[model samples]
Target: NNRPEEANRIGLNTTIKGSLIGGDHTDVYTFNVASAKNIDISVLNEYGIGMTWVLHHESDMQNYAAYGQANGNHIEANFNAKPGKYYLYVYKYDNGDGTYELSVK
Candidate 1:
């Protein structure tokens, strides 16, 4: 279980990699955008367990602007983001376990 404040922090042009080695696990990350920038998110599932993700405004978790689903072993989204804090929620569909590599740019 993860709270909004406990979300990991990531930056532009960086990659954060981790694994969901068990069922019902989700990973959350937050990034601060001081100015308008090109926001890119990508997730790669090594074991192909169908990784999914949602991109939302940090102040309102339910207000998601983008959603993604894995195709083969990868999922990605790109858009222009305004100045504010944003959140990323990544999880495996069907609660299947697998490893994932997340890239933010």
Candidate 2:
């Protein structure tokens, strides 16, 4: 599990944009992935967040983190986004349709 040290946390927000095409290459779609940034939040504490975290993919992970639900429930993460230094909390949605829940404070 991840451990927060009093005033720090882990936060993640990702935006995926794409479009469907019916004909030739003359269609386009765009959206504002900005709001997704503002909705992110993190906090710091002493309790652990997640266990067996950080996954490996595509040689090196772009930006991702996760815990085994089999080990425990989703651990709440607190975030700290500094000017040039902060923790990157990333994740990957798994198979077997279901919902993953996480909390932040």
Candidate 3:
């Protein structure tokens, strides 16, 4: 799941949990917006584990809208996103691997 080839689809008010068993593991999520909207993205990493995440436009992942590393088990961001597809990527930071919960609202 480190690549974008098999990104999962998610939506507003949804939450999903998964694990990063390996240092290089990552989970990519894709979602769509019918119109411009204010969106919130958040992540909760397991105790003692750190994670990093990025929000990007599906058309061009290089164009990141928001990105951050967890400061205290959680990392979150809110932004007014435009219509089209978007992606959220989360991965273990500094070789710290464990479980995490991601939510969109």
Candidate 4:
């Protein structure tokens, strides 16, 4: 029940739903900032069954900060991120599309 009805960009028919907590999982994203810096993450599964992503840039999760990434198949982590609640860990693969972008000043 991830309620995300357009708050800080994530539209384009936003389809983000998860309920599988196994094989390592931690999906928590809450970003609402008006001023910050560095934010650009990405992930994809698109109901293809094959995923991998691991990101962690938690600068104490301040002014919106707390990034975490650890999926499966092929993980990728990018530093420099500050905009709270970004803990995503969906492993094993199956029905997905994880995407995060940044451009705050």
Question: Where does candidate 4 stray beyond 4 Å?
Answer: 1-49, 54-74, 95-105
Q: Write the per-residue lDDT of candidate 4 for residues 1-105, one digit (tens) a residue.
A: 565332233321234544333432334433443344555444443343444434333444234233224454223344555444443333445544443322212
Candidate that beats the other on lDDT, 3 or 4, i.e. the better one:
3
Q: RMSD of each candidate?
A: 2.2, 15.0, 2.4, 12.4
- Write model 1 residue lDDT over 1-105, tens digit each, in one string: 644435788878778788887754788888888998777788988788866889997677687767775567778888888888888888766757888899988
Question: Can you give the TM-score per candidate against the true fold?
Answer: 0.85, 0.23, 0.85, 0.24
lDDT of 3 by residue, 1-105 (tens): 343447888877798988888754788888898889888888887755766789888777687878864568778888898888888888765676588888899
Q: What TM-score does structure 4 among the candidates reach? A: 0.24
Q: Summing lDDT over every window of 10 consecutive residues in candidate 2, give the lowest-scoring window.
A: 23-32
| Model 1 lowest lDDT segment of ten | 1-10
The whole-model lDDT of each prediction reads 0.79, 0.27, 0.79, 0.38
Predicted structure 1, TM vs. truth: 0.85
Candidate 2 vs candidate 3: which has greater TM-score? 3
Clashing pairs in 4: 39-102, 46-96, 54-69, 54-70, 55-69, 61-65, 64-83, 64-84, 65-83, 65-84
Q: Write the per-residue lDDT of candidate 2 for residues 49-74, one digit (tens) a residue.
A: 22212322223346533222332343
Provide the global lDDT of candidate 1 against the true structure.
0.79
What's the TM for model 2? 0.23
Count of clashing residue pairs in every prediction: 0, 15, 0, 10
